[PDB]
Design a protein around this motif. Structure first.
Motif, PDB file in Angstrom:
ATOM      1  N   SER A 191      -9.228 -98.584-107.729  1.00 28.32           N
ATOM      2  CA  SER A 191      -8.885 -97.186-107.980  1.00 28.32           C
ATOM      3  C   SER A 191      -7.379 -97.045-108.157  1.00 28.32           C
ATOM      4  O   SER A 191      -6.636 -97.976-107.826  1.00 28.32           O
ATOM      5  CB  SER A 191      -9.361 -96.309-106.826  1.00 28.32           C
TER       6      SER A 191
ATOM      7  N   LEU B 179     -14.817 -98.513 -94.417  1.00 29.68           N
ATOM      8  CA  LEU B 179     -13.814 -98.954 -95.383  1.00 29.68           C
ATOM      9  C   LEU B 179     -12.852 -99.991 -94.790  1.00 29.68           C
ATOM     10  O   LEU B 179     -12.702-101.085 -95.335  1.00 29.68           O
ATOM     11  CB  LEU B 179     -13.041 -97.756 -95.954  1.00 29.68           C
TER      12      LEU B 179
ATOM     13  N   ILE C 217      -0.476-107.430 -90.452  1.00 28.17           N
ATOM     14  CA  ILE C 217      -0.448-107.997 -91.807  1.00 28.17           C
ATOM     15  C   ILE C 217      -0.289-106.936 -92.902  1.00 28.17           C
ATOM     16  O   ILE C 217      -0.506-107.221 -94.088  1.00 28.17           O
ATOM     17  CB  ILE C 217      -1.653-108.951 -92.092  1.00 28.17           C
TER      18      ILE C 217
ATOM     19  N   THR D 102      -8.218-109.831 -90.038  1.00 27.65           N
ATOM     20  CA  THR D 102      -8.256-109.342 -91.421  1.00 27.65           C
ATOM     21  C   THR D 102      -8.197-107.813 -91.505  1.00 27.65           C
ATOM     22  O   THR D 102      -8.120-107.245 -92.592  1.00 27.65           O
ATOM     23  CB  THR D 102      -9.534-109.826 -92.146  1.00 27.65           C
TER      24      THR D 102
HETATM   25  C1  LIG Z   1      -7.513 -96.195 -98.059  1.00 24.98           C
HETATM   26  C2  LIG Z   1      -7.344 -96.541 -99.326  1.00 24.98           C
HETATM   27  C3  LIG Z   1      -8.293 -97.392-100.059  1.00 24.98           C
HETATM   28  C4  LIG Z   1      -8.817 -98.535 -99.591  1.00 24.98           C
HETATM   29  C5  LIG Z   1      -8.540 -99.080 -98.265  1.00 24.98           C
HETATM   30  C6  LIG Z   1      -9.177-100.177 -97.822  1.00 24.98           C
HETATM   31  C7  LIG Z   1     -10.213-100.894 -98.676  1.00 24.98           C
HETATM   32  C8  LIG Z   1     -10.178-102.420 -98.500  1.00 24.98           C
HETATM   33  C9  LIG Z   1      -9.824-102.914 -97.087  1.00 24.98           C
HETATM   34  C10 LIG Z   1      -8.599-102.217 -96.500  1.00 24.98           C
HETATM   35  C11 LIG Z   1      -7.360-102.526 -97.356  1.00 24.98           C
HETATM   36  C12 LIG Z   1      -8.293-102.465 -95.020  1.00 24.98           C
HETATM   37  C13 LIG Z   1      -7.539-103.766 -94.697  1.00 24.98           C
HETATM   38  C14 LIG Z   1      -8.508-104.946 -94.664  1.00 24.98           C
HETATM   39  C15 LIG Z   1      -6.727-103.683 -93.398  1.00 24.98           C
HETATM   40  C16 LIG Z   1      -5.756-104.849 -93.224  1.00 24.98           C
HETATM   41  C17 LIG Z   1      -4.312-104.457 -93.531  1.00 24.98           C
HETATM   42  C18 LIG Z   1      -3.816-104.880 -94.917  1.00 24.98           C
HETATM   43  C19 LIG Z   1      -4.534-106.107 -95.468  1.00 24.98           C
HETATM   44  C20 LIG Z   1      -3.920-103.713 -95.892  1.00 24.98           C
HETATM   45  O1  LIG Z   1      -2.432-105.216 -94.815  1.00 24.98           O
HETATM   46  C21 LIG Z   1      -7.584-101.192 -94.526  1.00 24.98           C
HETATM   47  C22 LIG Z   1      -7.824-100.113 -95.580  1.00 24.98           C
HETATM   48  C23 LIG Z   1      -8.915-100.733 -96.447  1.00 24.98           C
HETATM   49  C24 LIG Z   1      -8.681 -96.965-101.452  1.00 24.98           C
HETATM   50  C25 LIG Z   1      -7.440 -96.528-102.228  1.00 24.98           C
HETATM   51  O2  LIG Z   1      -7.853 -95.954-103.471  1.00 24.98           O
HETATM   52  C26 LIG Z   1      -6.615 -95.504-101.439  1.00 24.98           C
HETATM   53  C27 LIG Z   1      -6.151 -96.039-100.083  1.00 24.98           C
HETATM   54  O3  LIG Z   1      -5.233 -97.120-100.278  1.00 24.98           O
END
Ligand SMILES: C=C1/C(=C\C=C2/CCC[C@]3(C)[C@@H]([C@H](C)CCCC(C)(C)O)CC[C@@H]23)C[C@@H](O)C[C@@H]1O
Ligand code: HEM
Length: 404
Positions: A88, A177, A290, A391
């Motif tokens: 996105s 998420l 991380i 993670t």
């Molecule tokens: C909220 C948002 C979104 C996704 C967040 C996610 C999805 C994948 C897994 C994530 C990135 C988690 C990570 C595995 C947490 C570890 C910390 C990191 C790797 C980000 O250092 C935290 C938030 C998660 C969608 C985006 O469109 C808006 C915002 O951006």
């Protein structure tokens, strides 16, 4: 099969905590290793650098040659789930200057010192409300679901203009998420949140409302200064960050303070120590350790080591916060120390937007627990708790607690 020694110079990364308030063994290894940088192997087999020292972390986080572009192929994704961020439009956490600044500044007014100060009575009301609900429900409670999560949830929802009536939906989606184990599960949770936030935007266009989302709809969106999908992404970032971080800090802080009874007693006896103790807990627990992934867009030399353009770099703030050249006996919790200059909130242009909200919340939370439930203790041994993997945002999904 492999019939030879298995030692590597690029260890698997990330690693899981075995103790809530101590580095994984592998992270302690990296901390002790000389030099600002170390090679690691990510989940997909690709190699990246980690930054393992405090000053070097500040320098690299300030370096414009390290991009936060999460849509770049070379970005150091740490799990399969991370692939849902590069699907996105990016919220400003994934943007570089000048785009980063134009988007961040649309949100800063909600997080100023004046606004945070003004929120104190509201935060205090929310904290005590959930606290006396939990206590009235009788001992043997899950502190996470009954206190740690709903508190920052209600606060961030008010800031954003997200109706708390829908909390079971978006709290579930937030957890799904952030803690997703695969890309498909993450994308589903994202699509769920996106559809909901999309509906809220349309509602705001018809009937203006309070909160950041309300303001962004009536102003920036009406001027075409932000894309509709960008507004969704921005709202989602603030909603999830506002939920998960403070919740994690609360639960891990309780565990940590209970394992250090002398300091917790000292804390109770002198509440002027609370703001300083919150800083120490932030340094020590580094729950977003991380959240410092970057991609080099140009060659960078760091103390004799070369980061090549196209290479991924992760600034590991937990390890950096255990730099003994900055924090004397770094692995000891000391609520009396100066934990100033810590990297739990990052550094530079992407430094945590919500840091002062988190500080207020934790101060209010700790004072409230000491006031209302000084006999709070774990209902299970620390050994029986399940820590989240390395993670994701650090913490526990369940915290059985009891009192007298
Ligand atoms: C909220 C948002 C979104 C996704 C967040 C996610 C999805 C994948 C897994 C994530 C990135 C988690 C990570 C595995 C947490 C570890 C910390 C990191 C790797 C980000 O250092 C935290 C938030 C998660 C969608 C985006 O469109 C808006 C915002 O951006
Ligand atoms: C509770 C303790 C918290 C910790 C330890 C923490 C940690 C961090 C870290 C390390 C970063 C830097 C990420 C990077 O450089 O890529 C960050 C950024 C951010 N945080 Fe926090 N956070 C906390 C609470 C909060 C809260 C309550 C909010 C409320 C909205 C929030 C919102 C944000 C946002 C929007 C960013 C992105 C800033 C930018 O890219 O300009 N955080 N956080």
């Amino acid at each position: 099969t492999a019939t030879t020694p298995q030692t590597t110079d690029a260890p698997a990364f990330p690693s899981n905590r075995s103790c809530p308030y101590q580095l994984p063994d592998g992270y302690a290894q990296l901390r002790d290793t000389p030099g600002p940088l170390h090679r690691v192997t990510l989940y997909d087999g690709r190699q990246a650098w980690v930054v393992t020292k405090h000053e070097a972390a500040r320098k690299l986080l300030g370096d414009p040659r390290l991009s936060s572009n999460r849509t770049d192929d070379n970005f150091p994704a740490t799990s399969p789930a991370f692939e849902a961020v590069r699907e996105s439009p990016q919220a400003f956490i994934g943007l570089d200057p000048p785009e980063h600044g134009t988007r961040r500044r649309m949100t800063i007014s909600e997080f100023t010192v004046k606004r945070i100060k003004g929120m104190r009575p509201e935060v205090e009301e929310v904290v005590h409300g959930f606290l006396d609900e939990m206590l009235a429900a009788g001992p043997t409670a899950d502190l996470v679901s009954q206190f740690a999560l709903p508190v920052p949830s209600m606060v961030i929802c008010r800031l954003l203009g997200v109706p708390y009536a829908d909390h079971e939906f978006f709290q579930d989606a937030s957890k799904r998420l952030v803690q997703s184990t695969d890309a498909q599960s993450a994308l589903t949770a994202r699509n769920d949140l996106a559809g909901y936030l999309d509906g809220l935007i349309t509602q705001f266009q018809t009937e203006p409302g309070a909160g950041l989302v309300g303001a962004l709809v009536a102003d920036q969106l009406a001027n075409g200064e932000i894309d509709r999908e960008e507004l969704i992404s921005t709202a989602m970032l603030l909603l999830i960050a506002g939920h998960e971080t403070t919740a994690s800090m609360t639960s891990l802080s309780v565990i940590t303070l209970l394992d250090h009874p002398e300091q917790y007693a000292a804390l109770r006896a002198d509440r002027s120590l609370v703001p300083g103790a919150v800083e120490e807990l932030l340094r020590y627990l580094a729950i977003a350790d991380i959240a410092g992934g970057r991609v080099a867009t140009a060659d960078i030399e760091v103390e004799g080591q070369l980061i090549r353009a196209g290479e991924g770099v992760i600034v590991v703030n937990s390890i950096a916060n255990r730099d003994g050249t900055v924090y004397e006996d770094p692995d000891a919790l000391d609520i009396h120390r100066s934990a100033r200059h810590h990297l739990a909130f990052g550094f530079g242009v992407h430094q945590c937007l919500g840091q002062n909200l988190a500080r207020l919340e934790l101060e209010v939370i700790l004072n409230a627990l000491m006031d209302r439930v000084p006999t709070l203790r774990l209902a299970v041994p620390v050994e029986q708790l399940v820590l989240r993997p390395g993670t994701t945002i650090q913490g526990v999904n369940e915290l059985p607690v009891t009192w007298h």
